Each structure stands twice: as C-alpha cells, then as structure tokens.
Amino acid sequence: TVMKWKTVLAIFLLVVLYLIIGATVFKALEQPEEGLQKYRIIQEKIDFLSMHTCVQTSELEDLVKQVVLAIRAGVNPSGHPSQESSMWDLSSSFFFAGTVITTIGFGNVSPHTEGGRIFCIIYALLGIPLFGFLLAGVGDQLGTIFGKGIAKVEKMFVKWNVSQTKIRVTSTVLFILFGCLLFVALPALIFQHIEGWSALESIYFVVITLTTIGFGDFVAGGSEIEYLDYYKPIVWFWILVGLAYFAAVLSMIGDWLRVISKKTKEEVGEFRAHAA
Amino acid sequence: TVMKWKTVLAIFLLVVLYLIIGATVFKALEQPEEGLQKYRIIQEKIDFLSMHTCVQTSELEDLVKQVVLAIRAGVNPSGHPSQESSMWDLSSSFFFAGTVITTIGFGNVSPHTEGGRIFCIIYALLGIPLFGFLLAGVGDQLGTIFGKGIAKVEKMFVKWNVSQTKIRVTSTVLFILFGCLLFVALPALIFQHIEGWSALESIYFVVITLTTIGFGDFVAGGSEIEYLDYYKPIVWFWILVGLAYFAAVLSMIGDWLRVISKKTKEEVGEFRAHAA
Numbered sequence: 348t349v350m351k352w353k354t355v356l357a358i359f360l361l362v363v364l365y366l367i368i369g370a371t372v373f374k375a376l377e378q379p380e381e382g383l384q385k386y387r388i389i390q391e392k393i394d395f396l397s398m399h400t401c402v403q404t405s406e407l408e409d410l411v412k413q414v415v416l417a418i419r420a421g422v423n424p425s426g427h428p429s430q431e432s433s434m435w436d437l438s439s440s441f442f443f444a445g446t447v448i449t450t451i452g453f454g455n456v457s458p459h460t461e462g463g464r465i466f467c468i469i470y471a472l473l474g475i476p477l478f479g480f481l482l483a484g485v486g487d488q489l490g491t492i493f494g495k496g497i498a499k500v501e502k503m504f505v506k507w508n509v510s511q512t513k514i515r516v517t518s519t520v521l522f523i524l525f526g527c528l529l530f531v532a533l534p535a536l537i538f539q540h541i542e543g544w545s546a547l548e549s550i551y552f553v554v555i556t557l558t559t560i561g562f563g564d565f566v567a568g569g570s571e572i573e574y575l576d577y578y579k580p581i582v583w584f585w586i587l588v589g590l591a592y593f594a595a596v597l598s599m600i601g602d603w604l605r606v607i608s609k610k611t612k613e614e615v616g617e618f619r620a621h622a623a
Numbered sequence: 624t625v626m627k628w629k630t631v632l633a634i635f636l637l638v639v640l641y642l643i644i645g646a647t648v649f650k651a652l653e654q655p656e657e658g659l660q661k662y663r664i665i666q667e668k669i670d671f672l673s674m675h676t677c678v679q680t681s682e683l684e685d686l687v688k689q690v691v692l693a694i695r696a697g698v699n700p701s702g703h704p705s706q707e708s709s710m711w712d713l714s715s716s717f718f719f720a721g722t723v724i725t726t727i728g729f730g731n732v733s734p735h736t737e738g739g740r741i742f743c744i745i746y747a748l749l750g751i752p753l754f755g756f757l758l759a760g761v762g763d764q765l766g767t768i769f770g771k772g773i774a775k776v777e778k779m780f781v782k783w784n785v786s787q788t789k790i791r792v793t794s795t796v797l798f799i800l801f802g803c804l805l806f807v808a809l810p811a812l813i814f815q816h817i818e819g820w821s822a823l824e825s826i827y828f829v830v831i832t833l834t835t836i837g838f839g840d841f842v843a844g845g846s847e848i849e850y851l852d853y854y855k856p857i858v859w860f861w862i863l864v865g866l867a868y869f870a871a872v873l874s875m876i877g878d879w880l881r882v883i884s885k886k887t888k889e890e891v892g893e894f895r896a897h898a899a
C-alpha cells in the first residue's frame with residue numbers, strides 16, 4: 348500500500364517506453380494499407396465522374412458529405428431501410444445499456460440527442476458501481492466453484508504419489524486451458540458460423556470485447572442480417588461470465604509481472620553488491 | 624469477502640431491472656430522431672437521382688457502398704486527402720496505443736490487418752496490468768497529496784470551534800467540487816474553444832472518456848483541422864489524472880450504494896419484526 352513516489356516515476360517511464368514501442372510497430376505495420384485504401388477511393392471517385400458526364404465534382408462531394416452525415420447519425424445509407432426495422436428497439440436499447448454499464452462502449456449506437464446524452468451520463472454514473480458489485484459476486488462464485496472442483500480433483504489425484512511442487516502450476520495451466528477453450532475457442536466458432544467472420548476476426552472480437560476495450564469495428568449484434576431471438580441473451584451471458592474470467596486472468600498476469608519485478612530488483616541489487 | 628449465492632441473485636435481478644428501465648427510456652427518447660434521419664437520407668438520394676438524369680440507382684448504390692467501405696477502412700471519403708497527412712503517424716499510433724492500454728478504445732482508429740490485430744491482442748494483454756499498476760500509483764499519490772492538504776486545512780480550521788460531525792461531509796463536498804472544477808469544468812472549456820463543440824457535447828465527451836466507456840462519436844484528436852504540437856500530450860495528462868479522480872469518485876458512489884443497501888436491509892428487517 349501507498350506506493351512510493353520513486354516507484355511511480357519508474358512505472359511511468361516504463362509505460363511511456365511501452366507506448367513508444369507500440370506506436371512504432373503500429374505505424375510500421377499500418378501505413379501501407381491506408382495508402383492503398385486512399386488510392387482506391389480516389390480512383391473510384393474519378394472513375395465515377397469519368398463514367399457519368401452529368402455529375403459534377405461539387406454535387407458529388409455534397410452527396411458524399413450527406414452519406415457521411417447519414418453514417419454519423421446511425422442510419423444505413425445503402426439500400427432502402429424499412430421503417431419497421433428500427434435499430435433503437437428494446438433489444439438494441441438493452442444491448443446499449445449493457446455496454447454502457449459494462450464500459451465496453453462499442454459505439455455503433457450512440458445517443459445523438461441532448462436528452463439521450465444527459466440520461467447516458469447519469470445512467471453510466473449510477474450503473475458502473477452496480478455492475479462492479481455484480482461482477483465481483485460472479486467472480487467469487489466462479490472462483491469457489493472452480494476451487495472446489497480442483498480440490499476434489501487433487502484429492503482423487505493423491506492415489507498416484509506426486510511431488511508437492513508443480514501442483515499449483517498444473518492447476519493454473521488447467522484453469523487457463525479450460526477457460527480459453529470454453530470462453531474464446533467456442534464462442535469464436537459460433538460467431539464465425541452465424542456471421543461469416545474469419546477465425547482471426549472472431550478471436551480479435553472476443554479479446555477486445557471481454558478486455559472491455561470495445562473498439563466497435565466488429566460487433567456481434569450489428570449486421571445487415573436477421574438473427575435468432577435468443578442470440579443476444581446468450582451473447583450477454585457469455586459476456587458476463589467472460590468478464591469475470593478475463594478479470595481473473597489479468598490479475599494473474601499482473602501477479603506474474605510483480606514477481607518478475609521483485610526478481611529483477613533483487614538480481615540487480617545482488618549484481619551491484621558483488622560488482623565492486 | 625466471498626459473496627453469498629443469495630446476494631448474487633438479488634444483485635442480478637437489480638441489474639436486469641436497471642437495464643430494462645434504461646432500455647425503455649433510451650427507446651422512448653431515440654426513436655423520433657432516427658425516423659427523421661432515415662427520411663432525410665431517403666429524400667436526399669431521391670433528390671439526387673431526380674436532379675441528375677444520367678445516374679441510375681444501381682450505380683448510385685454501388686458508389687454509396689464504396690463510400691461506406693472507405694469509412695470502414697478509416698480513410699476520409701470527402702475531399703482529396705493528401706498523402707503526407709497520414710492518420711497512422713507516431714502521434715496517432717501513440718494515441719491508439721494509449722487507448723488500448725487504458726481500455727477506452729475510441730474505435731476511430733482500428734487495426735484492419737492480420738498483423739495489426741495479432742499485435743493488438745498481445746499488446747493489450749500485456750498492457751492492461753502495467754497501466755493498472757501505474758493508475759494505482761498515481762491514485763495513491765493524488766490521495767496522499769490531497770489528504771495532507773486537507774489535513775493542514777482542518778488544522779488551520781480549529782481556530783473557529785466546530786463540531787466534529789460534518790467535517791468529513793464538508794471535506795468530501797470540497798473534494799467533489801474541486802475535482803469537477805479542475806477535471807470536467809475546465810477541459811470542457813478548452814475542448815469547446817479549440818474544436819467548436821457545445822457545452823453538453825464537451826461534458827459528455829469528458830464523462831465518457833474518463834469513465835472509460837469511449838464510444839468514439841466524439842474524439843478530441845480526430846477532426847478535419849490542425850492542432851498545436853502539444854495538444855495531444857496535454858490531453859493525455861488530463862486523461863491520466865482524470866482516470867484516477869473518476870476511479871476514486873466511482874469508489875465513493877459504490878460505498879454510498881453499499882450503505883443504502885445496509886440501511887434498507889436493516890429497515891426491512893425491523894419492519895418485518897414489528898409488523899407481526
């Protein structure tokens with residue numbers, strides 16, 4: 348408790364170095380794709396203006412602006428969207444309120460109005476503590492159930508005499524393998540089958556959603572197709588349990604980082620001490 | 624610790640009721656705006672096809688699809704974007720990596736490639752514990768500095784004799800007022816002046832960003848204008864300190880919810896006991 352001011356500066360420098368490395372890698376990987384996309388869109392527009400004589404550049408840019416505002420407003424520009432197929436229905440509003448309290452915030456659906464934004468601010472402010480409580484309760488229940496399960500597994504295991512060492516390592520590898528299998532390996536398959544995504548896109552969606560980053564480029568609910576009535580409830584249940592499992596996994600990764608930090612500190616101190 | 628299975632069910636029912644209420648309110652507020660937007664875009668397209676004879680509906684829908692894919696790819700359709708003005712530069716990649724580790728995830732900038740997505744998954748998985756450590760350290764430092772400040776304020780206050788009661792209430796109101804003034808009241812003014820947003824949009828942006836929901840509809844960095852060189856670093860510093868202040872405020876709101884829960888439980892038990 349009460350981390351010293353010297354440790355905070357070192358952690359800050361480590362974080363800034365991590366950001367510099369991530370920025371370099373992202374910049375190196377992502378510039379060519381954006382260059383090709385820019386040439387593709389410019390060539391598409393010049394092709395359209397070449398093919399159609401009547402159109403002129405000012406009107407075409409005005410139409411492109413209208414389309415961009417249409418996407419900003421949340422309405423689909425392409426096709427004739429039916430009035431009955433409202434995107435703000437109770438199932439979608441339920442999904443939106445769940446993302447707000449969860450703090451995933453995909454962003455495909457946004458308020459866009461003064462009253463929606465005010466109610467979003469008050470609703471989020473009240474909502475986050477309540478979900479934090481629910482998540483802590485679900486995490487504790489999951490932890491006790493898994494702990495009793497591996498307690499009886501270990502108890503049965505005592506028939507074949509085994510060293511006390513590596514029993515925790517094996518229990519942890521079993522936890523990681525079962526958790527990834529049940530949370531990332533299977534929902535990725537269901538999402539891929541019901542939506543046409545690729546395996547990497549499905550894994551990326553599961554990781555971004557459960558980690559609560561929620562970029563919004565890949566959203567399970569939002570597509571120009573019709574799903575089953577119970578698809579969204581099942582997705583929310585997978586999200587609720589996955590959030591607990593990922594929070595636990597992140598805590599374990601943090602614990603590993605601390606040990607590596609303590610080990611590095613003692614090793615550096617020992618090398619300093621003999622070095623003289 | 625180890626929340627009972629009965630409490631978890633009650634918290635789950637409360638959360639589901641909260642989502643039903645939020646969904647109803649959001650649906651009631653947001654349907655008309657979407658209806659008007661849908662009519663506006665349909666009327667704009669039929670007006671364009673009426674004004675231009677040469678254009679036909681299949682080609683116009685194809686052009687709208689090309690524009691929609693251009694927005695999905697992250698490139699601006701409207702205007703001629705210069706090749707030099709890359710959106711994936713080190714300043715932007717730094718902003719993106721900061722949102723990934725922070726878990727705000729605005730979503731304006733996304734990987735879009737197999738290597739970007741794989742590196743995003745590994746980078747986030749390592750990054751979140753490190754930021755959690757940095758955030759805890761900054762929160763502890765802020766708490767100790769504020770605690771010593773109000774310690775000396777209280778010590779000076781003892782000249783005028785005051786009741787021991789309400790001293791904590793006054794310190795907490797002072798903390799809330801100073802924190803909102805310095806974190807939400809002023810950055811909203813700077814964002815509004817440098818970007819043209821309204822006051823409600825600025826307050827909404829600050830709340831969504833610091834709460835880590837990060838919808839992405841309002842992003843300080845992304846606009847079709849040029850800012851000062853140091854604008855993004857100052858924004859990141861405001862985000863780093865704001866995250867600690869909001870985490871503290873959310874913890875206080877959670878503590879208030881717990882007390883109201885304990886008070887409600889004892890009041891219901893007492894009413895049950897006498898009721899007979």
Ligand SMILES: CCCCCCCC/C=C\CCCCCCCC(=O)O[C@H](COC(=O)CCCCCCCCCCCCCCC)COP(=O)(O)O
Pocket residue numbers: 436437438441445575576577580581583584587638639
């Ligand atoms: C993080 C918190 C975890 C919570 C996860 C559990 C989810 C709780 C459950 C249920 C439903 C919540 C809102 C449903 C309101 C439906 C009202 C309705 O009319 O359905 C319409 C939706 O359209 C549909 O009918 C089909 C699509 C969604 C399903 C409709 C209602 C749910 C029925 C089946 C699934 C619920 C539970 C299944 C359990 C596996 C909305 O249009 P409108 O109202 O304007 O007419």
Ligand SMILES: CCCCCCCC/C=C\CCCCCCCC(=O)O[C@H](COC(=O)CCCCCCCCCCCCCCC)COP(=O)(O)O
Pocket residue numbers: 362363712713714717721851852853856857859860863
């Ligand atoms: C949550 C963590 C909190 C961290 C907050 C502190 C931020 C740490 C600081 C600094 C800069 C990090 C990346 C900058 C790399 C700039 C390289 C560069 O050339 O600048 C170009 C950006 O364009 C510009 O020159 C102007 C726009 C951004 C500023 C450029 C560099 C920073 C100079 C001033 C501000 C830094 C610190 C000011 C302190 C108030 C990138 O284009 P390219 O590389 O392809 O040629």
Ligand SMILES: [K+]
Pocket residue numbers: 450451452559560561726727728835836837
């Ligand atoms: K988020």
Ligand SMILES: [K+]
Pocket residue numbers: 450451452453454559560561562726727728729730835836837838
């Ligand atoms: K987000």
Ligand SMILES: [K+]
Pocket residue numbers: 450451559560726727835836
């Ligand atoms: K988050």
Ligand SMILES: [K+]
Pocket residue numbers: 452453454561562563728729730837838839
């Ligand atoms: K987002």
